Amino acid sequence: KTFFGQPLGLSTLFMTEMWERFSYYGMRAILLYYMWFLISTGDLHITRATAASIMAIYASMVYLSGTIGGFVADRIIGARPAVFWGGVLIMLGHIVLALPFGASALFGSIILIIIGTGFLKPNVSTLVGTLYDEHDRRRDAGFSIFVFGINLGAFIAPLIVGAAQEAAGYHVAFSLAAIGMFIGLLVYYFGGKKTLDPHYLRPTDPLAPEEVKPLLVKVSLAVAGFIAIIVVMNLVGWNSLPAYINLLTIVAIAIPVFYFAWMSTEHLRVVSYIPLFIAAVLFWAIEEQGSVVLATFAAERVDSSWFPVSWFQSLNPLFIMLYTPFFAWLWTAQPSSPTKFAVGLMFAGLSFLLMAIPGALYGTSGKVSPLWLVGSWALVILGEMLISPVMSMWFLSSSVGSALNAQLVTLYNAKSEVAYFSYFGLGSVVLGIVLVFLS
């Protein structure tokens, strides 16, 4: 008796992550429309472009947070408490949006979910590893299943939450996201006590006595530096919301740039990763624009009067679930991995070049078939299979992509739509071609 051949403990972690991803993408699917709503009613004083930018940098900080969450668990609080308290924070994040408040609750929600997801996401992935001995052949399949649960949650969430929002309003809808996380916590807490190794209740690599001060000094100088930059920003008058978004943008992008510089055999192999890293960043940029630019296109440019427009956010994980089996049968039934990055990026590029067509053909003032978006996601997710299944800089790439997005999505609107999709679509394809030369 197993969970699809794997230890039953995988079900617990499967469920845990499925329900967190549910809460997250349920929130993601309507948060942009929520901010629109708050703007339309005069509660939130930003442009829609800024709103879009907020979505992107939000994602960016979530993934950035995920890059330290593993450290915090491994060295300070343990993987299992990280996941639990991570989940608690996420739930609080959604509860904050379920409360009868408006724009004033957004920052609080975002911070709670940023911190919480940073604690939970990397560490739930870690606990999946813990189900297996070093020599266990099932490890790849186990993770493959675990990834299925991520998208299962990501898939039904826009459906359920979007429907709820339409039916009962945003606050109720966001409360459902809170409930989603609560369900995950329940299964995680009680299921975890039955399946998970007690060793992970504590850090497996606790800070040695002499490691504490140096860590403390490093964090302190960073926070002080960040605070100092903000002080200077405010004295010089660079204190608009977009200004803060730019600071966050710069921080998120400077982080890999500093590792670039930081680091002849091993050299030319670190240098060799840079085009790959750029490729991943650009891919995730495009992929992460699904919930922002494509979310916007869905709401403004699509014949969608008969269903909640947030449901388009289900197309992304739907296609992942559809493609993953095929690519199992395919990688065994061969392109080099850098080549896989190029083509993955090429397909992302094509997913945007496609989107240029309805506007170029039909104009951008009318509405087009939903199939355009369906095809768009079909292409980018095809790209995801090529790059995703194939260390810090890697999970950092998605944060950098979203940071880049915080800048780029503010350029998207009906007037720029065709050029936007065309140029960044063509750019990605070309850089895919560039990678081919370098492959």
Ligand SMILES: CCCCCCC/C=C/CCCCCC(=O)OC[C@@H](O)CO
């Ligand atoms: C396996 C991945 C390959 C799939 C990618 C190809 C997807 C291309 C889709 C283009 C079709 C969208 C337009 C068709 C349509 O319904 O037009 C009718 C009209 O109402 C459009 O405004």
Ligand SMILES: CCCCCCC/C=C\CCCCCC(=O)OC[C@@H](O)CO
């Ligand atoms: C204002 C919002 C309050 C949020 C409270 C949500 C509760 C947090 C997690 C629920 C997961 C189940 C936890 C079960 C549990 O801790 O058992 C209680 C006790 O046996 C443990 O010492």
Ligand SMILES: CCCCCCC/C=C\CCCCCC(=O)OC[C@H](O)CO
């Ligand atoms: C690993 C930590 C990542 C850094 C955490 C800082 C990120 C904090 C907020 C993310 C950006 C959110 C800006 C949008 C926002 O807060 O909305 C506030 C309302 O619009 C107020 O006008």
Ligand SMILES: CCCCCCC/C=C\CCCCCC(=O)OC[C@H](O)CO
């Ligand atoms: C006010 C936020 C409180 C929540 C804790 C967030 C974590 C804040 C400080 C933890 C110190 C993290 C420094 C270590 C680190 O990030 O290194 C990452 C390495 O790349 C992992 O190998």
Ligand SMILES: CCCCCCC/C=C\CCCCCC(=O)OC[C@H](O)CO
């Ligand atoms: C801020 C309101 C929320 C308060 C949280 C409820 C606190 C109640 C009990 C604390 C539970 C601590 C257990 C955390 C943990 O390590 O989970 C691991 C489980 O044993 C399964 O992995």
Ligand SMILES: CCCCCCC/C=C\CCCCCC(=O)OC[C@H](O)CO
């Ligand atoms: C050691 C890290 C754990 C601490 C997590 C930091 C939490 C930071 C901010 C959470 C506060 C969110 C509440 C804000 C809020 O409720 O909206 C404001 C009022 O309701 C306005 O009507």
Ligand SMILES: CCCCCCC/C=C\CCCCCC(=O)OC[C@H](O)CO
């Ligand atoms: C103990 C933590 C688990 C809590 C999970 C979330 C459940 C909490 C509240 C559910 C209902 C939230 C209020 C819904 C709401 O007020 O929407 C109505 C709007 O105000 C419009 O009438």
Ligand SMILES: CCCCCCC/C=C\CCCCCC(=O)OC[C@H](O)CO
């Ligand atoms: C209200 C701000 C609270 C923010 C707290 C941020 C803490 C950031 C990093 C924690 C580093 C210090 C950890 C101390 C610790 O427990 O390690 C002890 C050693 O492992 C001893 O075995």
Ligand SMILES: CCCCCCC/C=C\CCCCCC(=O)OC[C@H](O)CO
């Ligand atoms: C956002 C972080 C703001 C900067 C301040 C971070 C300080 C947070 C925690 C540092 C506490 C000092 C670490 C030493 C410590 O408490 O460990 C206790 C020992 O592990 C007990 O044996």
Ligand SMILES: CCCCCCC/C=C\CCCCCC(=O)OC[C@H](O)CO
């Ligand atoms: C981590 C270092 C942060 C960056 C330090 C750069 C310092 C450069 C100028 C600081 C000037 C602070 C007062 C300026 C001020 O009050 O207003 C200036 C005028 O509004 C425009 O120049």
Ligand SMILES: CCCCCCC/C=C\CCCCCC(=O)OC[C@H](O)CO
């Ligand atoms: C995770 C703890 C590390 C500390 C980072 C916390 C976030 C710090 C700065 C981001 C603030 C984002 C802007 C929030 C805001 O509403 O300011 C907008 C002003 O109203 C400008 O008019």
Ligand SMILES: CCCCCCC/C=C\CCCCCC(=O)OC[C@H](O)CO
């Ligand atoms: C030792 C490095 C010190 C400087 C670090 C670089 C980061 C400095 C500022 C972050 C970006 C601020 C740009 C402000 C901005 O975007 O425009 C201002 C607003 O749009 C107008 O209110």
Ligand SMILES: CCCCCCC/C=C\CCCCCC(=O)OC[C@H](O)CO
């Ligand atoms: C395997 C499926 C691949 C589907 C993607 C193929 C897309 C190829 C070319 C699309 C280029 C559309 C740009 C049209 C354009 O820019 O016209 C400008 C008009 O004046 C509208 O501003």
Ligand SMILES: CCCCCCC/C=C\CCCCCC(=O)OC[C@H](O)CO
């Ligand atoms: C199993 C793969 C089957 C092949 C799918 C690859 C799709 C290749 C090219 C699709 C061309 C994209 C342009 C769509 C298009 O131009 O149609 C316009 C609308 O039909 C207007 O009526």
Ligand SMILES: CCCCCCC/C=C\CCCCCC(=O)OC[C@H](O)CO
């Ligand atoms: C089965 C996918 C799960 C649900 C995801 C929601 C995706 C939203 C729409 C996808 C299907 C669109 C309807 C198909 C179609 O032919 O378009 C009808 C339009 O009214 C034509 O203008």
Ligand SMILES: CCCCCCC/C=C\CCCCCC(=O)OC[C@H](O)CO
């Ligand atoms: C193994 C993956 C399964 C394949 C899924 C790929 C499907 C991706 C996009 C489907 C949209 C293709 C357009 C359909 C179409 O041409 O219909 C147009 C109508 O006849 C309107 O004239």
